[PDB]
Subunit: 174 residues, 2 copies
Amino acid sequence: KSVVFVAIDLEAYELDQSIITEVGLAILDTAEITKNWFDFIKARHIRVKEFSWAQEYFDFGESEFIEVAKIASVLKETIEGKRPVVLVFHDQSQDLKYIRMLGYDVASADNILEVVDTREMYQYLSRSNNASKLSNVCGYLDIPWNMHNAGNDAVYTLQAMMGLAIDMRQKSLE
Amino acid sequence: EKSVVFVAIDLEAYELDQSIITEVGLAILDTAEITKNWFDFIKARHIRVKEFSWEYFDFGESEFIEVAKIASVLKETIEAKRPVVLVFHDQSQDLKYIRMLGYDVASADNILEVVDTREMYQYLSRSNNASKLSNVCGYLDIPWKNMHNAGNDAVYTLQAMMGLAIDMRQKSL
Ligand SMILES: [Ca+2]
Ligand SMILES: [Ca+2]
Ligand SMILES: [Ca+2]
Ligand SMILES: [Ca+2]
């Protein structure tokens, strides 16, 4: 049994929302660990080569430059290669729009097992005691985070959910 | 430079006698050490408690320390100076064990926050997205060896909360 976790983030130009400028991908193939999960996270930052003027580096690899016409096939290869895929988003509606605008048809993919939106879970956690504590500590620290990079955005999203999922599982078995 | 020390703790008691402490798990993250990537700066310790001085641990080598010295080890870890965030799973049980070792963590005045993941997971039990992850992990049924190891238990606890806290912060900005 194997599942491919795919975290995705896309950015659009501030002054022209029809222009998609970067794609962040963070992949975790459980088949590659079936024992230290975060070492097996494959991250990619894709800068749209036609729109690199439309305006941070990539902290988990080297940023790629790809033409807009080639982006869709890259996304299709990532998601469809068919092995079951779990999509992880923050703000699912916004990112699904951006993916469509790049020429990829998510609906065509028959191998999507689940879609996870952290924006829902974090909203849900907004009235959580322990979650609020963590926020206060991070708010106190005011840590300055390279920060708009879609590649980083996707990695942090995947690490957060995988770390949470693994822990909840292990603690439930004991 | 403002800094906080995150300390994840797990203790284990003997199966047949909950008065006998057998293991202590510590996972430390000093934010001052990042002010690479955050999880690379996590310092883990596994202590098997020997009663007298004359599975495995996947994040280092297990230490052997006598019961009489454990309290000071914990106190040194927590304490005094810099603010400490305590991270537990089942806070009451672990605080009990520590007290029985002669150290009163609650007495420590440098405690900024105390986080109990067992509460959050209870709260997340009726979460839509959390349930999705659970079903996938239940299907995969990935076998993690040495899951009862108190050292590993603390590392997974800290990684889960730090990864969650960092992400929640960045996405809110
Ligand atoms: Ca984005
Ligand atoms: Ca997003
Ligand atoms: Ca324990
Ligand atoms: Ca515990």
